[PDB]
Amino acid sequence: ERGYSFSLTTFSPSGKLVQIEYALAAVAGGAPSVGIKAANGVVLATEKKQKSILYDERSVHKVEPITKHIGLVYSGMGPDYRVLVHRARKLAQQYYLVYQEPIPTAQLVQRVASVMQEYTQSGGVRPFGVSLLICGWNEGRPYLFQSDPSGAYFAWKATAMGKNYVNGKTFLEKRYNEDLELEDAIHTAILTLKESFEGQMTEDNIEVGICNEAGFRRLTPTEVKDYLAAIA
């Protein structure tokens, strides 16, 4: 191991990080996902389209928690998502060790953004090919953050990454309310997911996590299909 000390990401003559644009293109080409906020919580939804049923779709998970009060989903490359979620878990654990208090979601997203920036400006590495939708609850408040492969971040009330992501964003804008409940958030998220699923969603193909004052928890297929039945 030597390690290249020249940053693979470089400023184009126009200043645009065309490499980061290609990373975002890979994100768009990856599986879609959506995130939405309610007046008292956050809901993250995404689809897991495997090949034919020979894959045990139950065995693998896409929605992942970082703490009891923080979860996230990704759009892009699973290999990058695994290492990124592992590092975010380490950062949250280190913060909890240092300050004996749960990680604020904003601070965790800031740390993830710093990690992504270090990757993008460092040498010998590849920018991450994922976009993270992060749900968190702290101080009796919900938080939903968009984090891009460029390393920036935003607090978004609703978002949709992946294929047809602009249309998903417009659909969420049309079907989004300021003071909706968690039930309305779940209805809207599943509605967007079925509007952009392309292939007759199932309870196995939809995996959803909810973050509120009670913490973050992933809905099992039972109540998953229950909500799909209630939403039609």
Partner 1 sequence: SRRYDSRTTIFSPEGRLYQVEYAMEAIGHAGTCLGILANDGVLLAAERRNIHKLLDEVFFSEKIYKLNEDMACSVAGITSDANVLTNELRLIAQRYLLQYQEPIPCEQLVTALCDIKQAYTQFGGKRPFGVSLLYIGWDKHYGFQLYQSDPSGNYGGWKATCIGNNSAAAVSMLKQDYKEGEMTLKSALALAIKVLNKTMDVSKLSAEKVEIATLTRENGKTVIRVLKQKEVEQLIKKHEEEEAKAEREK
Report in angstroms how near the CB of residue 150 gets to partner 1 at its nearest: 6
16 versus 68: smaller Cβ distance to partner 1: 16
Do residues 7 and 20 touch, judged by C-beta distance below 8 A? Answer: no
Report in angstroms how near the CB of residue 202 gets to partner 1 at its nearest: 28
Residues making contact with partner 1 (CB under 8 A): 4-16, 37, 110, 113-114, 116-118, 120-123, 143-144, 150-159, 169, 172-173, 176
60 versus 152: smaller Cβ distance to partner 1: 152
Report in angstroms how near the CB of residue 159 gets to partner 1 at its nearest: 6
Report in angstroms how near the CB of residue 19 gets to partner 1 at its nearest: 10
117 versus 164: smaller Cβ distance to partner 1: 117
71 versus 203: smaller Cβ distance to partner 1: 71
User: What is the residue-wise DSSP string for 213-230?
Assistant: TTEEEEPPHHHHHHHHHH
Give, to the nearest 10 degrees, the angle between helix 78-99 and helix 105-121. 130
Report in angstroms how near the CB of residue 214 gets to partner 1 at its nearest: 21
43 versus 116: smaller Cβ distance to partner 1: 116
Do residues 196 and 32 touch, judged by C-beta distance below 8 A? Answer: yes
CA 173, CA 215: separation in Å to the nearest integer?
A: 26
Task: Provide the β-strand partners of residue 218.
Answer: 209
Query: Shortest CA distance to 197 belongs to which of 169, 156, 163, 222?
Result: 163
Task: Provide the β-strand partners of residue 217.
Answer: 210
